[PDB]
Amino acid sequence: YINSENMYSVVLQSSINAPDKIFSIRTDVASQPLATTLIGEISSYFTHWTGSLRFSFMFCGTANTTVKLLLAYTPPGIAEPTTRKDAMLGTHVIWDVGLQSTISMVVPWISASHYRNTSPGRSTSGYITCWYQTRLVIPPQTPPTARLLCFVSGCKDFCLRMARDTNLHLQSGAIAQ
Amino acid sequence: DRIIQITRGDSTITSQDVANAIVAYGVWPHYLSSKDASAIDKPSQPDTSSNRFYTLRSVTWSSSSKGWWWKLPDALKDMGIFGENMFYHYLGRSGYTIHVQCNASKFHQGTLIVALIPEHQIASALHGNVNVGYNYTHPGETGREVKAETRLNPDLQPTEEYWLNFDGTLLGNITIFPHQFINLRSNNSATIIAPYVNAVPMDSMRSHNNWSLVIIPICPLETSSAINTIPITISISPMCAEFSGARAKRQ
Amino acid sequence: DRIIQITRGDSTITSQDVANAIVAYGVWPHYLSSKDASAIDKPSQPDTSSNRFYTLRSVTWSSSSKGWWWKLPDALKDMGIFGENMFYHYLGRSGYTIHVQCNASKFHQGTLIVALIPEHQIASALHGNVNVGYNYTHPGETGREVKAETRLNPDLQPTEEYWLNFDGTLLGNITIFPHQFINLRSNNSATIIAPYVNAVPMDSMRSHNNWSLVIIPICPLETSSAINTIPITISISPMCAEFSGARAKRQ
Amino acid sequence: ENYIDEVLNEVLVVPNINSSNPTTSNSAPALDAAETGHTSSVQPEDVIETRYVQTSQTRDEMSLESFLGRSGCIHESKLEVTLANYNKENFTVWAINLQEMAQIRRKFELFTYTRFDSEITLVPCISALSQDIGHITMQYMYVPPGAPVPNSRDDYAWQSGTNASVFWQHGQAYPRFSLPFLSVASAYYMFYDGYDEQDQNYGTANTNNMGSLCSRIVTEKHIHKVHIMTRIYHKAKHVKAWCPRPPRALEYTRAHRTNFKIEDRSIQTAIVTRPIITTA
Amino acid sequence: ENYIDEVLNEVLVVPNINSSNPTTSNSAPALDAAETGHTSSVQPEDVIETRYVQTSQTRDEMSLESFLGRSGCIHESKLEVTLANYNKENFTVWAINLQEMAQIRRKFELFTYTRFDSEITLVPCISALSQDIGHITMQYMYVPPGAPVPNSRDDYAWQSGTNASVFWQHGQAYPRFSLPFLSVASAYYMFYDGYDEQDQNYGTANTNNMGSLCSRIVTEKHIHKVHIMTRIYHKAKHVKAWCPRPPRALEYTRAHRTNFKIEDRSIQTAIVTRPIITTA
Amino acid sequence: LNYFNINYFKDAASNGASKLEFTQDPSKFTDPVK
């Protein structure tokens, strides 16, 4: 799903009965795959950043379908978790789907200094993962899969400084007049 | 309403259809007063690094299940900072918050009983002069499940009579203990808040179990869908924990 | 007077002949104010369960010794609650209290230099394009002793030039750093109290060493008795420790 | 009180962080509905236990004046002199438009309408192709629409009766001048969905027409061969903007158009693939 | 009252000297114990008979602003132009660091942390390898971390949409500009006892990363062979410092490291030997 | 702390950069509704 709309959603299966992982991304504001969002694009014009981040998820399935999920954030200084037990030992939120179809968690600002480089190089800022909590249950004669969406925006303490030139665009030849 | 939101430490729990909440005996957890204190050393309070939500391993509910039970604080014996503090000290006390989640579709039927029992002393399985071994009352986070196949060391195992509350009292009178129901047509969650109850202000955490959690399916699970096995998940959060008597690690 | 008594947690230290005490830069340790805070989560303060005295392994002082050095907080990486908290979190800060004890008879002579150096960055041993390995700057509680026999991995070891302060500065100018002397004819103890110094309010505890302890015998040990080897013991006590950013254990 | 803050750039303060305590209630601020087209208003002190922190950052560098008030190159003109037919060649004409340099174009195309004053600086360079250069003088004239456009080095249009001109000679500093907001409407157009009166020229090719910029060498016939290259830099002042737009993702191809197709070339963006999504 | 003193540099007065008389008592200020880690507080009027003297010296020149507020060279860049493949070569890139000149490095490494503003001056020089030089123009651009780094003389990165640039031409004075305190933390690191996230690069090689400085020649193709050498000078303003350290005793070998070993070379310091200690 | 600021030309365009004012925090973008 490299050039299509399928790159914005992730599928859930009801044939899985186990505490498995769904996806995991890095929390650096200017790294892939969140470097191309609005906040990521704007941050590429500066060098330092600070503040908290907000993530939102929306469930797109049949109105008779139920599920429970776990969203966790891992502070830096350790490897990426591979089991639910390690993931639980941290900042996490438990989500239950109902009449409301959206949940929102935040990533607190935890760093030694006051600012971070938008291009860190070797350093990291943590990870965020998602795991099955109980199961995905469907009634008879229902599609056996569901989709998910993710959003991102900045909290009230977000800031930028030391403006620079972006690295997400280039000019190879000459623009025709 | 049906909406609830609980935030203990850095973790939050939400649910869109609940049935109120239960405070055991109408008392909220708190710290220890100087009027009742016995030991004289200064206690240690980890605060937010230990009063958070921990989730245990799930279990599978089928049409032939019979029940399960756990024990506290044995279940959280290795959950990070709480377990380390429990194993590094000699005395401790804490409250608890229990959340049970189990969801199904609109074409399922079934009912569960969730109860919290203080000083639940179980009975032995065989006759004669026998007692219960130590390893079988401390199964960790896996808990105990009632089955039928032959187990090892029959002279140390506990009984499997679920209908006798595992100790010789009739099921159905269990409603005096703090409890709640889970009806698949009404709700899918249960919440119980429990303070610290004991005859002494503080006690050893590795030789005494204050509380016990029991889950019993009163009505069998039945559906016509292709999803005939539903998982059940439990989360527990300590409240107002404090420890005393620092020494070397017991392990 | 010559009497001193220090009580940090549940431990007490006494000495009958000391020479005052040193407060590094004339600042007493304290907690972090909201004017300088960067992270927004609530910190955890173990208090008395971690601010206690820990004693390291002893070393032997002979007529041919040359010196030793340690690093902090690497030395206390496995001292109970402090080590567990250090390895379970991501950020932390603390102060320290150092006591060095070494006693002899009235027929011995010798002198030691005890100094505390901030951001002591040591130099490499060989020439060319080389650097210092990770394992050799974190020796634990055993510390590092200057010797002469060939070591493994020569391209990663640090230098042994004790007279150059291990980094290219002449010995004897080390008196600007907080320091004290131990003269066998006058005293047998030294005490230094140090606050938290850094360019950031809080920092990772496993990738940065704030302080360093150096012991150098300036005058050789000499006596006519049958006891020609004297041991040296070091005790350290954290002060006002706090941690933040709870996650899974790094190990 | 006002000099101090702006000298220290301490305007535009940021809210602080308040402490919180464990809660358990019926109201759940974490739950919401995203189908309303609104942004959630959850703050860190609603889902976790926080500490009282006095923030000190100020958001002055993200203002529009700071963001758009930097000089950048917009054009490069090359003029080669010929010693044969001296009075016919040796002049250049360029039509003004801010749509030929990627950086400036992408920076300014983040909005739909803008209104600002301009500032122009010139950097002339002389390349020596002979034993010596001598004395060199250059003239630049601005030709508004409708004014006669010269077509020779000795044309009468260079008298500059009303048109503005500037002169430069070797050994002189860089010329500089200012321009006001010169448009018929109340703002500039970066995107136009419309045509002209003949139903042709779709885009911004019709609304934006600011005139031309001409240059020539004033020195008479000589025996030196040289090349002249001049670079033009632009900076905006007193800026306003409306209706932000998403940033550009691909390379530009033509001016006044949004086409991105390239012959014998696949579509390439800034997104990098991964082997598997369960490993960061 | 305040203009006069500082114009005359009469601030920071020094205490006077008081007269004394012969004494004989039980208290002995000369005796003390040096094991306490303290400095003795004996004054000349305690061990000898003195005269009343009104001192007139002032300690203004030993202040930090005076000590560190002097310009000094920190880098030298050499650029040789080639008439073949003109648009490929003829550019230079340097990474900013104050650790390549002995005098400045040793002067600043007397402390552990510092915080100051900077001031930069450039001194360009042109070497003529042909019959004439002609017209020469140069450009210098500052590239913060993360910004694209040009790799050709005609790269698009030279448009300088947001990056700061400066221009110089023959016959012009020396360029000069100022910089603020640009660091993520609250102070600069001259010594760092730590590693990176991969347990590599011990020292200050990871904390200090301020970007790069690039330069190029803007003049187009010509027929002259020249060499350009530019020197950069730096001076500090509004200085603060913490935690003094002993001065360096040996020669430096590498940047961001404290190694001093040299192949086939004995250790040499500033101490000179004597034949015998009883003869000064 | 303070500084001098005098205009010399008769035109407004001739003057320097505008004085930073506000950010109009109320964002109709976040909540596009009356």
Ligand SMILES: CCCCCCCCCCCC(=O)O
């Ligand atoms: C040398 C004069 C250059 C002045 C051009 C600045 C004004 C252009 C504004 C709109 C141009 C466009 O959007 O293409």
Ligand SMILES: CCCCCCCCCCCC(=O)O
């Ligand atoms: C041309 C720009 C030069 C500015 C460098 C001055 C700031 C450097 C401060 C710390 C550098 C270091 O210590 O190596």
